[PDB]
Amino acid sequence: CIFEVKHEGKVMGYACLVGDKVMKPAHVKGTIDNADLAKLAFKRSSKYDLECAQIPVHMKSDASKFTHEKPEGYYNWHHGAVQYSGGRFTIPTGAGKPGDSGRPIFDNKGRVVAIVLGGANEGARTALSVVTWNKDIVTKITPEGAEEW
Amino acid sequence: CIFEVKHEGKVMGYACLVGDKVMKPAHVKGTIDNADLAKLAFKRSSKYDLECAQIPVHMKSDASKFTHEKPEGYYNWHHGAVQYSGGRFTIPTGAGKPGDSGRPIFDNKGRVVAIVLGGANEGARTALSVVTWNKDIVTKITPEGAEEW
Amino acid sequence: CIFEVKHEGKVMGYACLVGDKVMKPAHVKGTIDNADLAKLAFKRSSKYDLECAQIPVHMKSDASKFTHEKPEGYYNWHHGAVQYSGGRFTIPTGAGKPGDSGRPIFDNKGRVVAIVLGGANEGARTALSVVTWNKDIVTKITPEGAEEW
Amino acid sequence: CIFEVKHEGKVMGYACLVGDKVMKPAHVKGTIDNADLAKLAFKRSSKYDLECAQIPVHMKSDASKFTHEKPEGYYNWHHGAVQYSGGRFTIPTGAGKPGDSGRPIFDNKGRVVAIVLGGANEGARTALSVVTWNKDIVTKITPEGAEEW
């Protein structure tokens, strides 16, 4: 489900197969390091800093579902455990760096809960700037002073 | 409840006694291999790719009830266990082939939950294209790129 | 640091990441079997039979440094041990064949000392024709009667 | 000796290095998944549904010889054992599917005896439609009602 965006042979961010679309932050330079994915036609959306396309039938079995359901508590992500509370995802400052955009924040049942776009450093912890699902529709939460990863 | 459609002495699909009607996919060539059923008058419906008729009184005891109730989880079908989630029934790719249309997807109490029409291959798993009951009325879910079995 | 030049799916010579450039003998037919390297713009130099380009930032950590420092004694190369003396690198005749151009001659600390271009057969031993660093600048030593590998 | 024809990243059939030519069924869509082989110039022949070219010198050691000698008995092929008798190769129906064209039928000494093109289903067993060598010249046996794999 996770695929890496490469630019001049260097990993810039990530791309993710969520739902039935193929996502990757718009700000990320490079092209998805996967033939099938790279040749697609993406629809940019500067409001959401998102850039989606549709998953080829032969990879649709490889998507990851996400959910609007996110109760205060701890979530899972590649670098460790994210913490959700007060309508804000945070992590120990230092555990997320530029080039981590696109990485999903799963819950304990595997449902993708949000997709990291960048983070604002507010001391001990960094409030993440994520793309999250509302009642049904996509949304974007960007803490004051975020640094787009 | 399940009866086979034969064409030039060859099984093409199936027919099923659900509710008080006798179903069989419209696209299936052949005639139900059962005297009583074969001589009936079916009403085609190209939107639903369905073709129903009414069950003779002497076979009505042989029908299968179906239900709108289908919670995420595993369902039963002739080739194994179907999986329901995200409003989509799926199976391990390869476990469903042309000539499986008409076959019901039962739950653990025997209630028919959907009727297979075909499936779209999306890699590891195939999203089934089924006829399913809504609040009260019939409906048809057809995943993008389905191959009508 | 070593990459192979392929021609019609056949290894012709080699390419090497020395200093901050990407080298490969000019006489070698084919294109470097590496996406990042292949798409580069090389500057040919018929005097040196050299053909250099610049190493992409993401591979610069993969270069090999070389040195002008080469005291009489034995050096290391893929096929064994080269011998340096009298201002000439030599090897047991037979241990170097066409398709060995581009291969570096390291010392015991890993510094690339010269790059093989071909060799002249003078009996028991073959005097190598190499590209070597002088005080600071590149140079090319070609023994009388060299056979360009 | 066996190489796979890919189409839109999907294996459609096979290509085989027999004698001194490089074969692949004409009906197979895609291009041989091998640089050296892909860039060749093939000569189509619609009568034989064959499409041959010549093996590059560097792969000629990789060809497979074939033989006109084929006595009634069992032959070997990737999915099992083929049976030859009455001038017809057959297999248990189901053991050969679309995408098996190009696959050779070897004997016990490795000599390629025929090359599968498709098969006609005649019940328990399927009569294969193959390309086979006569006294010296190529030939094609196609059982009535063959389904080109």
Curated annotation (Swiss-Prot), chains A, B, C, D:
Disulfide bond sites: 1-16
Subunit text: Homodimer. Homomultimer. Interacts with host karyopherin KPNA4; this interaction allows the nuclear import of the viral capsid protein. Interacts with spike glycoprotein E2. Interacts with host IRAK1; the interaction leads to inhibition of IRAK1-dependent signaling.
Location of region: Interaction with spike glycoprotein E2: 43-48
Active site per database record: 27 (charge relay system), 49 (charge relay system), 101 (charge relay system)
Marked site (Involved in dimerization of the capsid protein) residue numbers: 75, 108
Protein name: Capsid protein
Chain positions covered by the region annotation Dimerization of the capsid protein: 71-81, 107-111
UniProt note: domains: The N-terminus contains a nuclear localization signal and a CRM1-mediated nuclear export signal. The C-terminus functions as a protease during translation to cleave itself from the translating structural polyprotein.
Function comment: Forms an icosahedral capsid with a T=4 symmetry composed of 240 copies of the capsid protein surrounded by a lipid membrane through which penetrate 80 spikes composed of trimers of E1-E2 heterodimers. The capsid protein binds to the viral RNA genome at a site adjacent to a ribosome binding site for viral genome translation following genome release. Possesses a protease activity that results in its autocatalytic cleavage from the nascent structural protein.
Taxonomic source organism: Chikungunya virus (strain 37997) (CHIKV)
Subcellular location: Virion; Host cytoplasm; Host cell membrane; Host nucleus
Domain Peptidase S3, residue spans: 1-149
Motif (Nuclear export signal): 32-42
Coverage span on the entire protein: 113 to 261 of 1248
